[PDB]
Design a protein around this ligand. Structure first.
Ligand SMILES: COc1cc(CC(=O)c2ccc(C#N)cc2)c([N+](=O)[O-])cc1OC
Lengths: 255, 274, 41, 54, 59, 255, 58, 41
């Protein structure tokens, strides 16, 4: 009676449902967990807000048009202004967290389009200026608005050719990273569970983005004859097994 | 031992193994025996040569530098005159090994270095001098040499190696990362600052290797070129990523050149061309 | 295979891992999918 | 000193204030000490910038 | 202006309220710490980790 | 070897010490605790930030002069802008908490003065206008600055005659409430542990102040000949067994 | 193997480990667990590189 | 670890002492002082 198609996810007081999913991905087959004593270094007892931060936060919907290139968000950056989670990010020196990413996009059985939804650990962006130019803090911390891959370059920002993944590697091989596709004729949503992936037990949540989430149109959007030439794409993210450590005064970040 | 293909015959069922849904994000382990009639065959293969330990386990040149033996009289800047030289340790200067390492996100291993020094006397010389090279490791925080004859070359605590030019130096170094593994990529900064540097250039402050020639000068000038080779051993790798496609432009950052030739070959004909 | 040196870093290469499990990359799905059964049921 | 690995800051303030008794006006001083806990670890021996000749 | 016994004396002022007494970053291999036994030994090594013991004695 | 005089209190990453205390008071002999299932009503799973909110927060020091009347703070109001504790107060519909109040005041063996430090549950203030005038929200939510009992009345505010406890009862009987004295010749500090006291399992932390803390000079301050005619008084408060429930958008309060 | 820090919680006692008298000439072995709430962590370290044999051994 | 030479001085480094007792430096007091108890009673 059950199916990969229909699913429910409940975290905190938030619940998302989908009747047209395509299973769900658990990055590297590992569910998120808290930091065990054997791996810990920082001697401070941590804080686990649990239900107040481990819930679904919905970002502003993007608009998929016949010319969209794609979008890129970064975590934990994308949730820095989201309720108590955000507050904890700036009040603590350290912290670690996993997430459940849920990307939504519905059309009709007459539309056609295929979005690639992928999670890239340590997505170090490249400067469009080449040579050895850096990418200013502001530009890799777009917040919930994320980076629009079809927008023009800007001084100090990253390159945005969808084709080279913003880092000098080809789009086609992005599939080696935990991903899922939202193929309108099959899909309606994409779901990816991300465990904490880092070379350190815990880290700064403001100066380092652990993973970036990308929603990239591969097969372009096409709508039935005379229909609105666009569809909205919505991203909902929920932190899980979140730990904060080293509480002090609130942090002040670039701009 | 292991079977490469099992014997499989005709098929007519409702179990269709070759019909999947790649949007799930999975690569179902479909086999030839799932779509054609096969016979039994064995592997006779373990895949030992594709083990990450083997892949990164061989020496690759990671740096070339130059120093020279000549009269130091009058020279104000010894470093510039190359009476001695520096190498800000890093493994992303020469692209061959770099692309391999960057096939992964995190990497942990011990390193085995092999340093080759070759002499050269471009101008008139009566003989080939028998020079001894001193490679001293200068960890971040140690005093840097200013003159090829500083007190710094006493190397009381810094480890250093002395070897003849033309010969080769060899030793291994344990995994020195501060974290549990080295980062091949780092989506971050040193602190929350508007102008500070981005990328692993922030994490890679491994210090320098100072090279010099212990001998005093001869009548002629001798040019010694130093090549450092790196071999990884006791390897561990995590999070494989897409291979580097475009050419590199700088040590440590993912930057690529403006106006680069397309990487994907263009068909000489149709999409139907063989 | 006699170790002449005191430190571990001195020893030679490790030898084949002999683990070889591709599923954490090829099948990182939440609900197990059996080959032959409907991918989307 | 490296930014990525900075350790933070140490400060001291007046919780209430310093109060002196009658007939007392002399300056008051504090002596500060620093040491390591058994917690401590040091790695990769190297030369120090605290001595030279050259 | 020069090294002196006073360099070790932290002045405390009477009837001052909520004001700062002293401050310093924690680069133990430099700054105020550089000449201390801890700082001196710490500088013979590249890496450090662990907890520091900072104390104040009133005089 | 030990003594009521010397004590240490550690909560979170904060620790206070005193070498001249006079024991410590635990209101109605009850230590603070979390809300047990049998008493719960609200079905939402609660959030327990633990160490990130259960720590000592120090308010601005007051100045005790020869004419001070006293000061009055209210909880949780007094900590509404204190780190993560404050944030949680406004982001949640409900919450409950206990506290450890530590009032500090040191002088010399030549000074003399006696402060009454008391905790009053449900301290409903009175309007100085009499009749049936109310006391506007703003005036019972002074924040960490608290209410100065020697300041002038103000339209919409409470009466401030130290003598009538701001509520029509005599000062002398304030001792029926959990209290302690800071008698300069004996004391240096006063410590009071407050358990959650309410007629409901959990409550709104913004529209209702559970207790108010008062520091009242009884025996006036006197300093030795020619000394500064004032002493500072400092209040440090730490929440404990804090629970937050019903997280939603951030609350907006009067002014 | 060896613990770097034990798990320590809230504190309210007459045993004040952080109040000493340095004029005695001693450096009381105070730990982080004596002034803040800590979690359990291990050393994973022996301090072999700081042994005098190693220090003067090169 | 085969000693090729006859004299002790010929052998290599000693290996970690594994003693590590700082108290003779950190606590050289006559009357034992217990952490937590009054330093000056
Ligand atoms: C032989 O030259 C030396 C090189 C190094 C640097 C090293 O081993 C290293 C390897 C890989 C990565 C990465 N990613 C980072 C650092 C060290 N060192 O780091 O101490 C000492 C050397 O001479 C003692």
């Amino acid at each position: 009676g059950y199916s990969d198609r229909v699913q429910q996810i409940t975290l905190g007081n938030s619940t998302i449902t989908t009747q047209e999913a395509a299973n769900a991905v658990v990055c590297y087959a590992e569910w998120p967990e808290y930091l065990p004593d054997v791996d810990a270094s920082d001697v401070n007892k941590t804080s686990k807000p649990d239900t107040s931060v481990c819930r679904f936060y919905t970002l502003d919907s993007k608009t998929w048009t016949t010319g969209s290139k794609g979008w890129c968000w970064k975590l934990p950056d994308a949730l820095k202004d989201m309720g108590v989670f955000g507050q904890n990010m700036f009040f603590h020196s350290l912290g670690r967290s996993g997430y459940t990413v849920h990307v939504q996009c519905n059309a009709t059985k007459f539309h056609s389009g295929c979005l690639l939804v992928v999670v890239i650990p340590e997505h170090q962006l490249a400067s469009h200026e080449g040579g050895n130019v850096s990418v200013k803090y502001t530009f890799t911390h777009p917040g919930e608005r994320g980076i629009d891959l079809s927008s023009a370059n800007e001084v100090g920002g990253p390159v945005k050719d969808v084709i080279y993944n913003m880092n000098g590697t080809l789009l086609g091989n992005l599939l080696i990273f935990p991903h899922q596709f939202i193929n309108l004729r099959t899909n309606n949503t994409a779901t990816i569970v991300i465990p904490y992936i880092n070379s350190v037990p815990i880290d700064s949540m403001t100066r380092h983005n652990n993973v970036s989430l990308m929603v990239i149109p591969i097969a372009p959007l096409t709508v039935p004859t005379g229909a609105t030439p666009s569809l909205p794409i919505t991203v909902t993210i929920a932190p899980m097994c979140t730990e904060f450590s080293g509480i002090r005064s609130k942090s002040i970040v670039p701009q | 031992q292991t079977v490469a293909s099992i014997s499989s015959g005709p098929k007519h069922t409702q179990k269709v193994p070759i019909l999947t849904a790649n949007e799930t994000g999975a690569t179902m382990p479909v086999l030839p025996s799932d779509s054609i009639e096969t016979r039994t065959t064995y592997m006779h293969f373990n895949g030992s040569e594709t083990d990450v330990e083997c892949f990164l386990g061989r020496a690759a040149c990671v740096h070339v530098t130059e120093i020279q033996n000549k009269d130091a009289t009058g020279i104000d800047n010894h470093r510039e005159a190359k009476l001695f030289n520096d190498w800000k340790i890093n493994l992303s200067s020469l692209v061959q090994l770099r692309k391999k390492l960057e096939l992964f996100t995190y990497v942990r291993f011990d390193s085995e270095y092999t340093i080759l020094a070759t002499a050269s006397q471009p101008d008139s010389a009566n003989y080939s001098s028998n020079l001894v090279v001193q490679a001293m490791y200068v960890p971040p925080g140690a005093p840097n040499p200013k003159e090829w004859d500083d007190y710094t070359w006493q190397s009381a605590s810094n480890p250093s190696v002395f070897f003849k030019v033309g010969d080769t130096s060899r030793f291994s170094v344990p995994y020195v990362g501060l974290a549990s593994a080295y980062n091949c990529f780092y989506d971050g900064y040193s602190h929350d600052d508007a102008e500070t540097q981005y990328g692993i250039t922030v994490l890679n402050h491994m210090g320098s290797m100072a090279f010099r020639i212990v001998n005093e000068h001869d009548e002629h000038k001798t040019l010694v070129k130093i090549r450092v080779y790196h071999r990884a051993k006791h390897v561990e790798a995590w999070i494989p990523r897409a291979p580097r496609a475009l050419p590199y432009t700088s040590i440590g950052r993912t930057n690529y050149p403006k106006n680069t030739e397309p990487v994907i070959k263009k068909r000489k004909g149709d999409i139907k061309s063989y | 295979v006699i170790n002449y040196y005191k430190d571990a870093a001195s020893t030679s290469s490790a030898g084949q891992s002999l683990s070889m499990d591709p599923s954490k990359f090829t099948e990182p799905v939440k609900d197990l999918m059996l080959k032959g059964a409907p991918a989307l049921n | 000193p490296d930014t990525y690995t900075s350790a933070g800051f140490l400060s001291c303030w007046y919780q209430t204030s310093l109060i002196l008794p009658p007939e007392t006006t002399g300056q008051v001083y504090l002596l500060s000490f620093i040491s390591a806990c058994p917690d401590f670890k040091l790695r990769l021996m190297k030369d120090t910038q605290t001595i030279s000749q050259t | 202006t020069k090294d002196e016994v006073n360099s070790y004396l932290i002045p405390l002022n009477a009837n001052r309220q909520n004001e700062q007494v002293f401050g310093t970053n924690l680069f133990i291999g430099d700054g105020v710490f550089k000449t201390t036994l801890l700082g001196e030994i710490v500088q013979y090594y590249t890496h450090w980790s662990g907890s520091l013991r900072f104390s104040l004695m009133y005089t």
